[PDB]
Amino acid sequence: FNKITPNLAEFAFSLYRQLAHQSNSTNIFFSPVSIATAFAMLSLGTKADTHDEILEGLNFNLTEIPEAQIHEGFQELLRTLNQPDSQLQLTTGNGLFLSEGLKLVDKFLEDVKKLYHSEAFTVNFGDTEEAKKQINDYVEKGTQGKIVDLVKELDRDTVFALVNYIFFKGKWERPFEVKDTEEEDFHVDQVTTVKVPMMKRLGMFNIQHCKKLSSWVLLMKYLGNATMIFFLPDEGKLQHLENELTHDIITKFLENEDRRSASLHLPKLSITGTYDLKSVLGQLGITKVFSNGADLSGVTEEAPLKLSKAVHKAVLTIDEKGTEAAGAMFLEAIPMSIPPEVKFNKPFVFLMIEQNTKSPLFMGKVVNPTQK
């Protein structure tokens, strides 16, 4: 079970570590799962080196894992995320926009819609401004107005664009009380603070100090099928934490059933991340599909084709409760002993895990909550 989860985890860390190297003073936030799903889907229209580069760039060793197991893993993961009764409030979409003058292969359009429950559209790229409006209107409608004007430019030679979006609003299983949120200091570096809204609660937490990561490690469950893992590095240990993360360390944390008291301070947060996937995935080895030499003959047989534009935007909120409705009133028994004070009041890393598949839905780093 969950055959592709180790690969997605390695993809998350590969992509995270690239972005953390190219800029160390900005927030990072992206969805490993939604990017990987989009490009696994795209690979169904590619062949030969173009195809192999895509799946290898998603951390699949094609000498070891059969391709059927790759797509089966992605389709199972999509089953759990796009399910009717979910409390997770996770919406993701992927739009393919292809020049209306191309003769498209029906098999590819069928695979996209049927297997990957995604959307493909024809557009007139002879009108660059209107094509961009249509792409941005699609994303804005798909996010009920939350992501606007996603694509800012299209080269005149564009004939194929890909947009991938995801937005998340969660409800903690064990919520904070809004009355307890107050302004507190956030240490953006060792001598500087800014004021930010800080939630707090005294509770029984899946929390531990981890010597291997030199970090506090907090796991908090959402209503629905996911858990957020928060990593708080010890003084001067942020880089060490980023270097030492591994999938097996994460698995051990998810199996922990011990709970201890803590006085938790956690910032409210509105975070977004926007990335040019041609640039970012190019650094991970995915280059041919973006080049004139691209083998996209599963998309269109007669005419040349390349992917000219590929954009990812991820949006997430962290707040106290996420609903005016009263849920199950979980009562936690707090011992008569001093709880550790665990304050997420300096740069920290986080990772959201889907409960069934253990897949990495989001990864990010907060260097300043109000960097906005």
* Method of determination used here: X-ray
- Residues 10 and 79 grouped into a single domain: yes
Kindly state the helix (H) or strand (E) to which residue 283 belongs, with its residue range.
helix 277-283
E-strand ranges in the chain read 28-30, 90-99, 119-123, 160-169, 182-189, 192-210, 215-221, 226-233, 260-267, 269-276, 309-318, 341-343, 348-354, 360-366
321, 337, 358 - which closes a domain: 321
3-state secondary structure of 40: helix
Do 43 and 149 lie in one domain? The reply is yes
Domain with 273 in it: what CATH number?
Answer: 3.30.497.10
Find, among 359, 274, 372, 341, the residue nearest to 59 by Cα: 359
Q: Environment class of residue 217 by beta-carbon count within 10 Å: exposed (0-12), middle (13-18) or buried (19+)?
A: buried
Rounded (to 5) percent helix, strand, coil in the chain:
30, 30, 40
Domain boundary among 305, 321, 337: 321
Name 192's Cβ contacts closer than 8 Å, sequence gap at least 6. Answer: none
Q: How many helices (H) and strands (E) does the chain have?
A: 9, 14
Tell whether 185 and 60 lie within a shared domain: no
CA-to-CA separations, 243 to 67, 161, 246, in angstroms, rounded: 30, 34, 9
Nearest to 157 by CA among 290, 311, 308, 303: 308
Domain CATH code at residue 333? 2.30.39.10
Residue that has been written with the tokens 């055959």 in this structure: 3
CB 171 within 8 A of CB 322: yes
Q: Which residue has the tokens 């360390």?
A: 249
Write out the E strands in 134-178.
160-169
Name the resolution in angstroms.
Answer: 1.5
Q: What residue numbers bound the domain in which 278 lies?
A: 1-172+268-321
Shared domain for 44 and 91, answered yes or no, is yes
- Same domain, yes or no, for 250 and 102? no
Q: Find how far residue 229's CA is from the centre of its chain.
A: 13
Residues 253, 200, single domain; the answer is: yes
The reply to whether 227 and 292 lie within a common domain is: no
- Are residue 79 and residue 141 in the same domain, yes or no? yes
Question: Total domain count for the chain?
Answer: 2
Where b means 16+ CB within 10 Å and e means fewer, 134-149 reads bbbebbbebbeebbee
Residue 284 identity (one-letter amino acid): L
Residue 57 to residue 156: CA distance in whole angstroms: 28
| Cβ neighbours, 10 Å, residue 169 | 16
The answer to whether residues 84 and 216 belong to one domain is: no
The number of beta carbons lying within 10 Å of the beta carbon of residue 314 is: 25
**Radius of gyration of the CA atoms of the chain, in A:** 21
Same domain? For 96 and 31 the reply is yes
| 176/181 Cα distance (integer angstroms) | 8
